[PDB]
Amino acid sequence: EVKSSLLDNMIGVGDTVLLEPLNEETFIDNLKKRFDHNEIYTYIGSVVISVNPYRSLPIYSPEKVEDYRNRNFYELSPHIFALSDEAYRSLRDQDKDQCILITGESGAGKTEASKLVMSYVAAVCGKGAEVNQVKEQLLQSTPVLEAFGNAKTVRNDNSSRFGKYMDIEFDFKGDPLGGVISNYLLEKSRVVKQPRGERNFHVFYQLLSGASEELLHKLKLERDFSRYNYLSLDSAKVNGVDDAANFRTVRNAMQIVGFSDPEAESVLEVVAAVLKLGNIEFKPESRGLDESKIKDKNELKEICELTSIDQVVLERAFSFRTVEVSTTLNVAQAYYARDALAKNLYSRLFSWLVNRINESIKAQTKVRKKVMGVLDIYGFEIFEDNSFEQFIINYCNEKLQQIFIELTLKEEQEEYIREDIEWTHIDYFNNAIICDLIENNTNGILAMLDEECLRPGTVTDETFLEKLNQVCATHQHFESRMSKRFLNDTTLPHSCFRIQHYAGKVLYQVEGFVDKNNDLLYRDLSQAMWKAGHALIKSLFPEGNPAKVNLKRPPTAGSQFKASVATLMKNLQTKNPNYIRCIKPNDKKAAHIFSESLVCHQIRYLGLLENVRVRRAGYAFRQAYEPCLERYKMLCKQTWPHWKGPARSGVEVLFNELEIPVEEYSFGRSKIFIRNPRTLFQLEDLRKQRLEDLATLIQKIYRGWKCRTHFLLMKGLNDIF
Template sequence: MAGTIHEGAEFGVGDFVLLTNLDINSFMGNLKLRFQKGKIYTYIGEVVVSVNPYRPLPIFDKSYVDMYRGREIYERPPHIFAVADAAYKAMKRRNKNTCIVISGSKISYCNQTVFWRPSGTLKRTGTIIHPGKFGKYMDINFDFKGDPIGGHINNYLLEKLLSGCSSLSPEYELDSNPRNYYYLSQGDSSQVSSLNDSADFKAVNEAMKVIGFYDHSKTFWSIVAAIIHLGEVNFTEVGDDARIQNRNLVTTVSQLLSVEPSETEKALCKRVVATKGEVVEKGHTTDQAKFGRDAFAKAIYDRMFTEIVKCINKAIDLDNNNNNNRNMQSTVIGVLDIYGFEIFDNNSFEQFCINYCNEKLQQLFIELVDYFNNKIICDLVEAQHVGILAILDDACHTAGNTTDKQFLDALCKKMKDHKHFTSKSEPYYVRCIKPNEDKSPNNFNDQRCQHQVLYLGLLENVRVRRAGFAFRMPYDRFLDRSTWPNYRGGQPRDGVRKIIEEMGCSSDVQFGNTKVFIRTPQTVFKLESARGDKISSVVCVMLQKVGFFYRGVKQSPNFGKKVKWPQHPPQLQKVAATLQAAHRRWRAFKILEPIAASERPIFRIKLLAGETLVGRRKRWGFERQWTANYLTNPLWNGNAQNAEEVLKFLKDKDQFQKIIFASLVKKTNRFCKSTVRGLVITEKFVYKLDPKKKYKDMRPEKPIETSQITRLTVTPGPDYLLCLHLNDLNDVVVCLTDVTVFPDQTKVSEEMEKLKKLQSRDLVGEVVGRMMDHWIRAYKKRIDVAIQTTFECNFKGKPRFISAGTATGGPNLASPVFQKDKNNNGICLKWPDSRMFTETNNSS
C-alpha cells in the first residue's frame, strides 16, 4: 500500500496487495519494474520482499533511520527500516518478544541494517574471508525504557570457505591476486564490482576496535592466511602413502599457526585409526590427503569463526555487558539471518543443510497462508531412523571404508517409495530474492526470480492479505493525506467518513475505532487519484504566492534577503522549506553571477580568508589578484628563473602536486637573526630556500611536512607577520615582506616603480585563505588561525614572545626587521615608520 502512495505510479505498486490483477504475471511484472527503477523493497502487508540490487544504494544513512523512526509501516515507502521499527514498537507497546526472520539470497549490507555494529563485525568478516553463506541468530535485549542493554549471537551453517582475501598484507606471504590461490578461485570471480574489499577490510578492523578484540586481529588474519596457503599444498604418492610436494608451504603454514612443521605434516599425511582398543597411525593416499587437507582447512576456519562470535558475545552479552542489567527484566528482538534456498547442479552437504533449514522456516511462514504443507519434505530429511540425516549418520559409523556410493545405495533402498525423494515469538519476515546469478545490477532473470517467488509462497501470501482489507490507516493521518488538515467538523473519524461518502466509496469501507479500512485496491486508487487532483490546485495556489514573492525580490538590491516569506499551511511545511532552499540557491547565484567562472575558485578562497579575518584584521589583500606562487613571478622576484628551476627539481624529487603558497619572506630564528628566504608551502612539504645560494633547500634531508602545521598566527595590524606553529615545537616565524632580490641592483628602482602600481602587497590574507582551503579539502576541517598582537611561539622547544611594532627613533628602516624585545625577552618585528603610515592610509 505504501509504494503507490509515496513513490508514484512510475515505480509500480509498493505493496503487492494493491495489484489490480492478482496473478503471477502481474506480480513478476511489478517486481521487475521496481528492480529496474532502483526500488529493491516491496511490501506484502507487513512482509518485506527484498531484491538484491548488487550495487551500493544511498538508502541506509542516518537520514533514512530518522525518516522511519516512530512511523507506522505504511507511512513511508517500503524499507527494511520500517520492519525493524515495527518489531521494536510491537515489543515496547505489548512488552512482548518479537523476531525478524531474514531468509533468501541477499546482499550483506541489506541484512546489517537491522543489526548492531557487533553483528556488522561478524558479517563483514564473512564478506572478506568467506562468501557470506552462514546463518546466525541474534537476540537483542532491551530494558523497560526500550534501550538496548545486551545481546547474544549464535552462528550456524558456515558454508564454503574463503573469498576475496586480497586485502591481507604481504607479511602473510600472500600476493594481491586471489586467482593465484586454489581456495580463492573456485567461484566465477573473486571480484564483485559492487563490493570494495579494501574498504570492507578497514571496516572489519575498525569494528574489531569497537568490540575490543583488535589486539587479536593479527592472529585471526594469520589463521586466514594459513588456510589460503593450505589450499596450495600438493601431494605425491610414494608407494601407497602420500607425501607433500611443496614442503616450504608446510613451513609457512606452521609459522602462521604457531605449530611445529612436523605436526602439520603429520596432520596432513596421516590419520589415527582406533581398532580393538589400539590406536595406530595410518598413511593417507593422495586422494585421502587432499580431502583431509580441505577438511582440515574447514575445521580451522570454523573454529576461528566461532571464536570471533565468542569475542563479540563477550562484549555484548547481557551477563557480561553490565552487572546492573543482569537481573533486569528485559524484552528481546530476535534476528534470524539465514542464506536462502537454492538448487545447483551439484549441491554441497552444507547447501543441503541450508535448504533443510529453509524448509523448516517455510513451515512457520506457511502458517500464514493456505499453501502446500512441506512437513512431508522436512520429515524426509529429519525423521528418526528413516530420514536422510539418520541414514547418513548410520553410514558414517559403518565399519570399513564408507563411500558416497554406499550411502546413496542405502538411501535409495529406504527412500525408493517416497514420492518427494527424487524431487528437488511474533515474527516479521524479510523475504530476499536473487535477481540473477551474475551479480549484475541490471539483469533481472525472470525464470530464476519466478522460481523463488513461487517457492516462497509470496503470491499466496498476497491472496490471504487481500481476503481481508487491502488498506488501513489512522483517521488523523488519512485526513492529513487528503489535504484536509484544517478539518473543523468534529472528530477525525467524522471527517474521514465525510470524504468517503463524497467519493461514493462507503460500500467498500469499514470504520474502526481508530482506523479506516478499505477492502479493494480500486477504491484506494480512486481516492489517491482524487487526492492528486486536489494537490494540483493547492500547488497552483502556492506557486502563485511564491511567484508574487519572487517578482517582489527580483528587483530588490539584496535579492529578497529581508523580504518576509509568504505564509503557508502547516501541512506544506516541507514544500515551503524546499522552496526557501531554492530561493537561497537562486540568491547565491545572483550574487555570484557577475564573477567570472574562472575567478570563482579564487573567490572561494578569499571568502574563507574573509570569514577568518574580516573585523579582526584591518587589511588582508582582498582587492588584489591572488596568484599563489610569487617566487617565480618576475614582478615579485628578480631571480624568478632560478627559483623556478629549483621548484621543478623539488617537485620531481618529492612528488608534490601543488604549490599552495610561495614567496620571498624575511625569517627570524631564536637568536633574532633576520634572513631572506624563499618560503614554499606544498600539500606535502614546507621548504625554506636560500636565494643567495641559488635557492638551495635549507633542509634537503628532512623537509618540514605540511601536516606538521597545527595552527597559524597573524597580527591585527598592517604588518606582514606570520607564524606557522609546528607539532615538533620548532615554529616558522616570517614577515611576508615585499623586499625583492635582484641580481642587477641598477634595476631595483625601475622594478620598484612597477611594484608601486600594484594595489596591495599584503599576502597574509592569501596565506590564511589558501591554507584554510587546503585543510578543508585534505583533512575535512578548518585550520586554527589566531589573531593576536603578541603571541608565543617555540624555537627548538624554547618559547619566545613575538610581537610587531613601528620603528621609532634613530634612522628610518628601509625594510621590516626582527629585533630583540627587551620588555619580555622576546622578538619584535619592527615595521618602517613611513611604510606604516603609507599602509595605514591605503587601508582607509
C-alpha cells in the same frame, strides 16, 4: 494521530495482497512498475520486499525517520522504516525481543537493510550515540567475518557461507548496553574441497597474496596456489578483487577490533596450519587388508614446528584410533581425518574470532536485556552443479519458510476469529513434506546418508543414491533416473537425484555427499591438539583435555547441521519476527536495470506468492469501521457529511447504496472485510472522483465570495451620488 492511507498516490500496488489477478506475471510487473518510480519497498502484509536500487535514493531522509515514527503500515507508503518502527515499538512497549530475518541472494542489500534498521532505531531510541558505539565495531568487524566466512561461488563473487546474526542490547528502560554477533551453519566442507569455477574462503587467498615474504616465511608458505590442495590453481584470482589490498584491510580491522599482534599473528598461524594441513598425503603400509602410512613428513614437520605439537602424536593420530583397542586407520579413513582436522580447526577458529569481537561490546551489566537483532541467512541456491553444500542452504530456507508460512497462517486465522468471520481452508503448500523427506530420522536423506557412513563396509556415492532410490522412491517430491514424474521431460542421467522444494525442483549431484558428510573428529586428534604449544590451537580443542569426559562427538556432518539448524529455529521462535525479502534486479550491479528473468527466480527462491495466498486468506482487505467511513462517507448523499453513526451501520447503508453485492464483503465485530481488491479499487476510485467535486465546491465558492465582495465594496463607494 493521522488520517492517511497507503492507497493515496499508490504507484502500482503497495501491499501485494491487493493484487488481482495474482499470477507471477502481475507480480514481476509490479515490482518493476514501482522500481521505475524508485519505489523499491513493497509489502506483503507486514513483510517488506526490498529491491536493490544500487544507488542512493532520497527516501532515507531524517524527515522520513519521523514521518514513519509511531505509525501503522497502511498509514503511509511502503518503506523499511515501517518495519523498524513496529520492531522498536514492540521492543519498547512489550519488552519483547526482536529478530529481523533477512533472506535473499548476495548483493540484494541484506547488508544495507540491516544497517537501515539499526540506523533508524538509533534515531528514535533516544540514546543514539551509545547505540552507534556498537554499529561501528560491527562494521569494522565485517571484513574479518568475510575473509573467514565468505567465498566466491559460480554465481556470487562474495557469498556468505554462514548465517549472520547481530543485535544491539538495551535494558528495560531503553539504555543500550552492547551488542552480539553470532555465526551459524558454516560451510566447513569448503575448506577441504571446492568445485571448479568456485573458490575457497577469502582469507586464504588474501594471506598468500598480500603477506610480505617475511610473513610467509614465518608460516612455511609460498606464493603459489598450484602448490596447495585446499586451494585451486585457476579459480584463485577474481575480477576486481585485490586480495593483497583486502589483507591490509583485514590486518587493520583486527587491530581496531582489539587484537594484540601476538593474537593476530597466532590467528594467521592457524590459517597457515590448515592450508598446509591439506598437503599431507598417505599411502598404504606395504599393501588387501592392510593399513595406512604417510607419504612425506616435511609439511608435517613444518606444521609441528609452527603449531608446537609433537609429530609422534600426530603421526600416531592420523593412523591409529585409541577408543573403547588402538585400531589402525585405512588410507581413506586417514584422509577423512586430515580433512576433519582441517575443517574442525577452521570453524572452531572462526567461531573463536566471532566471540573475540563480542568481548568488546558485550553488555557488562547483568540486568535483564531486550534485544533488537537481525538474522541474515543465506539465499536459496540453484546451481548448475548442486552438491551437499547447497542441500543445507536450501534445507535451512525450507525450515525457515515452513516456520513462517504457518505462523502467518496461524495469525490470520487468529484474526478471522476475533471478528467472528468464518475460515476457509487455504489449499496451500504445506512445506513440511520436504522437511520430512530430508530431516526425518527414519526415512530421511540425512539419516540414510549418515547410515551409509556408519558402515565399516565399502560405501560409495552410488550406494547411497541407490539407497535413496529404494526408500525415497514413492515420495512424490523425490524423482530420480530409477524413481519413479509423468511429464514429458528428458530422462535424468545417473548419479543425480532431484527433489521439489518450496522454491522449485533442484537437481543434486551425489559426487561428494559421502565425503562431505564424513566429519569424524575422533579424540586422538582433539587430544593431540590439546597437547599443542599454541595458546589458540589448544583453546579450540577442549575435549582434548584428558579430564573432560571422553564421551563422543557430533557423529556426522549432516547431523551437525540438523542440530545447528534446530538451535536456530528454536532461538528465532523465542523472538518477535519481522522479515525483509531482499532482491537483486540485475546481476551487473546496475542502477536502473530490472531483469524480469533474474527477479522471477528470486520470487521463487523467497517463496513470495505463497505468502500472498497465505496472507490474503480469502478476504484480501479489512479496515476498521471508523476510518473506512471517514474515508468513503462522501460517496453517498446519506453519509455526507454525517453520518450514519455508529460506523458499522453507516458503512452498511453505504454499501447497500453503491449497489455493491453482499457476497463481496462481510461484517466483522470491528472491521469490514472485502474479498477481492477489485471492490476496494472501486471505492478508492469513486473517492478520487468525489474529491474532484469537493475541490470544485471550494473553488466555486471562493470565486463567488471574491467577486461578490469585490462588487459590494465597489458599489458602496458610489457615495459620490
